[model samples]
Target chain A: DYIPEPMDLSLVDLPESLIQLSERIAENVHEVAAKARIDEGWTYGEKRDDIHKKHPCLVPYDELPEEEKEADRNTAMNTIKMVKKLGFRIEKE
Target chain B: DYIPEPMDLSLVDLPESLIQLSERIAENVHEVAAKARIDEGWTYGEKRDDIHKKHPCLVPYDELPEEEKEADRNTAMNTIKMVKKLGFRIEKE
Candidate 1:
């Protein structure tokens, strides 16, 4: 019953590279999330199956519908935003 | 050069159950993220990984430091905010 009080990220601005990184991370987010579900016996189905743990959006990130993809993208964007808001830099080596 | 224009979720209000769900999802976020890093050959180090892909946050969700946990919580919170902002429902079934 605990609620998290995440830092406000409204003022954070991301570089173009970090923005692109978010897209890549988003794909990973989709894959990771899908893997978790699959690990829990969830399978790909045409529609959601809570009882059987089947879901429609179990495909690869690139194959996901735009609407479903948005969810992962949101997660990735928020992650980058949080990183930047925390004064962390994400640079390529 | 692509940048995602995610929908604003500032106005979305979440219920208590949904807020609790965010915390639960935060744990999943942490596990998924750590697993992704491990899949990429990253290991748990005493500090951030640079050259060797070692990181300090490869442990379990509960074992993560509070500041590190905030990142996952932010991802989960933003995901829920986006879902509610998009007029979707997240009810326990």
Candidate 2:
């Protein structure tokens, strides 16, 4: 039985673009939390909860549906090329 | 000729809500600056350069036309009421 584990964002070195995305997500979460009178602890929990709720909706890198796969493949290839450009070597884990 | 200075966000003790708003604003700014390869310099002048380049059309609060004034006044009054509710005496400077 293959049980897939949740992607640990901590493990994958987030590309600078995704880092920006994460920051924007945090900003919107903070704005809403502030309006709701929630403290920092509650805000942090809400952010994690939102991310967890959204994670399952994101198509996995390996299992992207056919129509979206092409776009995903292009992004993956570009990212690999970029990593190589930055003097990194890609190897299967 | 009335030369109105920019509101010194530093002068007014920001309410808790506005403090949270400021934090969100900073986080988004960081995300954008990081993506644009802009280094954070020590002064507001350096920040102003990027802010001017990125956002040309933001309205100054005092210059906000009549239509927007009501909401701004409401926010200001609510903030004052909140301060009083928290046991602060209001005095005109």
Candidate 3:
């Protein structure tokens, strides 16, 4: 018998109103990709890294490096602004 | 100087209500992993293949094989249901 991994619901445990927040974020990225005429070929996680390094704001994990952390924080702030501009709230709690 | 690639923003054209979806999905994934007490060592995308094969529904890219597409669709539909259960609307457009 295949024993499946356990389900984690931490986000699901978030306020019911916020559960969809992740989906909303993905949608916004898709939108930005579209507006920028981003190629779908570049959509894979690996390719996105190059784009992120180039565009900076488009990539989040890249900001984890020592020299880039501050820049990453700034990018995150800008991303938050972009998200808000697109009508979404940051989950600060 | 490094020549940066072009930007694509097709998704940005979407109504501002839907841009954050990808990040939200990542959040949900992280939450589930945490709740399941899933080991952080397994966080890479490569490990997801085995888990998807075992759980089926949790992995989307796997269902593309000819034999699995129907099951994949069913799984996708069920995923939509799960998403709605979490309070997010699927973008039909």
Candidate 4:
């Protein structure tokens, strides 16, 4: 299969049309799931409906508390950083 | 510029951790701006002050109404489709 050319996500300079990168600066999903709480050292995909029935995976990512989103946000950023440093990317147009 | 990497955003095979693409399915920003509104034939970045000042760029994206979000959401998806068709992509890891 053919591959589309990739861009450097870690690099500055997204197209001017998609210019507003500020909004995503402080976004994440840390507290979205108590089980995936960063304080607990969870790394993601560690849901526990048993202990968090009312607040399980049922919650939407956007609805989650900013406190809870920290893990995912940090993880997402770090992952992005690591991958970017390691030469990884997501295809955007 | 030296591009780090990129991937196909429309190819339907995102990494498992980011598999929650379902959250983005119905996203857009049509109603966010009464000026750049789609019903009014507004494409993108078409904002106004004296008209819809209460609902100008001053509002955060996530706080936008679903009806208003339609434009950006639709445009984003369409752009993704066209870009994928034209072999374009974003940098993701």
Per-residue accuracy of model 4 over A2-84 as CA lDDT, tens digit each: 11122233453333332222123222121222323433442333344223333233344555566545534433333333323
Residue lDDT tens for model 3, A12-75: 2223344324444333333343334234333324322443433333343332345444432322
- Model 2, B8-30: lDDT tens per residue? 22334533543334322322223
- Best by DockQ, which number? 4
By the TM-score metric, which is better: model 3 or model 4?
4
Residue B30, model 1: Cα distance from true site in angstroms: 11
lDDT of 1 by residue, B43-75 (tens): 888866457887787777788888657756755
Index of the highest-TM-score prediction: 1
Give the 10-residue window scoring lowest on summed lDDT in candidate 4 chain B. Answer: B26-35
TM-score to native of every candidate shown: 0.47, 0.22, 0.20, 0.27
DockQ of all predictions against the true structure, Cα-based:
0.03, 0.02, 0.04, 0.10
Q: Rank all candidate structures by their DockQ, best first, as comma-separated numbers.
A: 4, 3, 1, 2
Q: Per-candidate RMSD vs. true structure?
A: 17.3, 22.3, 17.9, 18.8
Model 2 bad stretches (over 4 Å): A1-93, B1-57, B60-62
lDDT of each: 0.60, 0.31, 0.34, 0.34
> How well does chain B match by TM-score in each candidate?
0.78, 0.33, 0.26, 0.37
Off by over 4 Å in 3: A1-65, B1-16, B20-93
